[PDB]
Amino acid sequence: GSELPQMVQQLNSPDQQELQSALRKLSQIASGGNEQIQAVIDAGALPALVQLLSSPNEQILQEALWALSNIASGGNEQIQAVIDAGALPALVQLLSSPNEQILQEALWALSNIASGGNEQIQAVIDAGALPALVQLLSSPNEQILQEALWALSNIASGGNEQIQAVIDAGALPALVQLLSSPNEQILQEALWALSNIASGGNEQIQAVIDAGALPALVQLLSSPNEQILQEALWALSNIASGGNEQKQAVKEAGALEKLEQLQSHENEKIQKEAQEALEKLQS
């Protein structure tokens, strides 16, 4: 028939050269936009790409993971098609891989799927991604740690059930430790993930407090780095949006003195955020 379903037919071919050629083309189409992603889906590529995730052939695996992560970068309905095809069990299994290239690509697809709706984020949790993601926060490999933080932040940006699943997987003590990191990129991502957990209910905001995040957050307000300051202010302001018990905990941590000083900062974005955080605590 048409050119795209023919490429899909070559994905199960005994000729590995014919397989790689068709796989390379479908991957290139899937990286060209939502309309091009749908053409790949309609040709029936997803069941065939999912089958290739089990391949012991790293050359096939790298192109198949590249294609799926790109299909997962489209709309919510396109992300759902990736889940419906049964990609999540294969993606979760690849998190225990000693191959850093396969691992990073599995982390790309999982974070992209976890960037969809609440029910889609829940499907990533139900597949069992959280234990491996929490474990990867202890990795000495800065690239893997960042990809794992990105995937965790996307899961933590979900609703009550999703944030609760992140807390229950023991992600908070690891995230609080990462606040004392010499790496500005890692610090930003740990602050992004903490802000998302603190964007939940009063009990979930309290879990961030019980984890010991406030002393580290209050100290980050004395940073000469305006970018770190904005990230730290975003996290504290989310905690400030909690109940009176949570508001009092921020006051005891010594935030009011620092927030009063930050109202006089040269940077306008820092001024607005610190004034807003102080408004939440004093009222």
Partner: peptide, 8 residues
């Protein structure tokens, strides 16, 4: 919920 498409 940031989505990333391919390299660069």
């Amino acid at each position: 919920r940031r989505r990333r498409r391919r390299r660069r």
